[PDB]
Structure 1
Amino acid sequence: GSLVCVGTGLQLAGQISVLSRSYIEHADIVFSLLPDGFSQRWLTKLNPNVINLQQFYAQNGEVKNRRDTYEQMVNAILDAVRAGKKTVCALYGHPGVFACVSHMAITRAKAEGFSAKMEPGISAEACLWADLGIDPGNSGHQSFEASQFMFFNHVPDPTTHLLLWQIAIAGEHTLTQFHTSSDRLQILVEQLNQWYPLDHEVVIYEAANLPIQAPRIERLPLANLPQAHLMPISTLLIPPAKKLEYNYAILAKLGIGPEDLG
């Protein structure tokens, strides 16, 4: 048995890599986690032997720690590998970007003496740069999971483009709810206000999953965030609050000045 984890990108059918599609086609079995039923039908036509990982999520308003969902997901994948199947895990976007299931499965597979690798895919971050026409290298880039930013001490660089992932569940500590509340978002606004003014324009971004769909690119003041309509697939972009300023300290060590810059 063996394992290969691939990503399908965000867009239907077209955003998967040539080689990754090939892996799905030749697999003995595929474990999937895709955005919608259109992608699910696409996958099944490519390879009929599919197990949908969606089933391991809380069903019927049940209370279930996502930690347990992920564990059950990993175990299902490993059961196929241990059985001797050439196993492919097909996750939307990049299989190892803000996704613990693939990394976990690969680690466990290697430990039990199985071949396991991960193939990179196109993530929501990659879609954002393209859709917004922003280069992460322009003034730098930082990414944080929203709740982690709240729970732990992170210090952002306000000259960079800052991304807060999973903004829709920002502050949801139990890991049992599918969305947070406005009061939690308000606490985030107050936290961010350390670096960013209340009137600072931020962007709620949602990459399209269908080819006939337009991305969501809603600009609004940071203050209005708690009233905004957020979805699980929402990412919050916080543009720079300050322009780049010369680092005279290091310039001096280099024995040069701003005017010497090419």
Structure 2
Amino acid sequence: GSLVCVGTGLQLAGQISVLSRSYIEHADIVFSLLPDGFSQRWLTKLNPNVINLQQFYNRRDTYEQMVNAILDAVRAGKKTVCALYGHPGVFACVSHMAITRAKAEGFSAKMEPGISAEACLWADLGIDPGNSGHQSFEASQFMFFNHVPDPTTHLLLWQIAIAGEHTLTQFHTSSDRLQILVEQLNQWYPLDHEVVIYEAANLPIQAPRIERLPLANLPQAHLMPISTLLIPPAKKLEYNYAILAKLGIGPED
């Protein structure tokens, strides 16, 4: 038995890598976790021996049961392939968990790169992340842990629609949690700073969501599970005089 985790990208059918599609096709069994039924129907036609994981939705326990199932296939000696949407190692811990555990039981396990939502974002918004620089955080992690963004460079907050999700202690709405996220961000970004709600298209006849609004309006925004928030720079670049100096560049340029 072996394990190979692949990604299908965001777009239906067309955004998977040639090699990754080959892995699915030659697989003895496939564990899927895709967006819509169209995606699911496409997969089935690639390999009729599919097990949909979407049948397990606490997240921890859910994932633990997804992993365990995948491993059962590997243990049984099957050439197992797990197919995830986008990139199987980008904000997706089900793949990493399965790979980690497989290795522990002494099985071959690896991950093939795929096209992530972030990859789609750059293209759709005509941004070159290479020259611009970029940052990414899980919205909830950004709230619950001490992260410091660099307000000179693009900032992406993933899973913005579940921002501030936790074991229920007191009554709080999504808007409430987002409001807190806004106040937190307000340390670096003015309330009137334009941000962008982005959602890559999943279907070829569908256009992406590229909605711009002031940060202050985020709590009132209609967000989807697939929503990613882009926060463009709000701080102007400044010379690293100290380092420039050592390189041989003084303030006299």
Per mean C-alpha deviation after superposition, the further-off stretch among 171-180 and 217-226 is 171-180
SS, match of residue 230 in structure 2: strand
Give the Å deviation of 1:8: 0.3
CA distance in 1, matches of 2:100, 2:165: 28
CA distance in 2, matches of 1:224, 1:29: 46
Give the Å deviation of 1:180: 5.8
Change (3 A) 1:179 1:219: farther
4+ residue runs over 6 A deviation:
175-179
Q: Quick one: which of 192, 195, 204 aligns to 2:197?
A: 204
CA distance in 2, matches of 1:92, 1:178: 33
Change (3 A) 1:88 1:144: same
Q: Give the total of aligned pairs.
A: 253
Change (3 A) 1:180 1:46: farther
CA distance in 2, matches of 1:26, 1:159: 46
8 Å contact from structure 1 (residues 5, 88) kept in 2: yes
Over the matched positions of the two proteins, sequence identity in percent amounts to 100
Q: Which runs of 5+ in 2 are unaligned?
A: none
1:24-51: CA deviations, max 9, x gaps? 0000000000000001110000100000
* Aligned equivalent of 1:68: 61
Change (3 A) 1:14 1:179: farther
Q: Quick one: which of 76, 84, 107 aligns to 2:77?
A: 84
1:54-86: CA deviations, max 9, x gaps? 0000xxxxxxx1000100000010000000111
Change (3 A) 1:44 1:258: farther
SS, match of residue 166 in structure 2: coil
CA distance in 1, matches of 2:213, 2:96: 36
* Aligned equivalent of 1:255: 248
Give the Å deviation of 1:256: 1.8
SS, match of residue 74 in structure 2: helix
Using structure 2 for the length normalisation, give the TM-score: 0.96
8 Å contact from structure 1 (residues 169, 179) kept in 2: no
Per mean C-alpha deviation after superposition, the further-off stretch among 250-259 and 81-90 is 250-259
User: 2:26 matched to 1:26?
Assistant: yes
CA distance in 2, matches of 1:180, 1:137: 37
1:83-102: CA deviations, max 9, x gaps? 01110000000001100111
8 Å contact from structure 1 (residues 66, 176) kept in 2: no
Give the Å deviation of 1:137: 2.6
Cα RMSD for the two superposed structures? 2.1
Change (3 A) 1:96 1:229: same
CA distance in 1, matches of 2:92, 2:98: 11
Change (3 A) 1:183 1:34: same
Q: Which runs of 5+ in 1 are unaligned?
A: 58-64
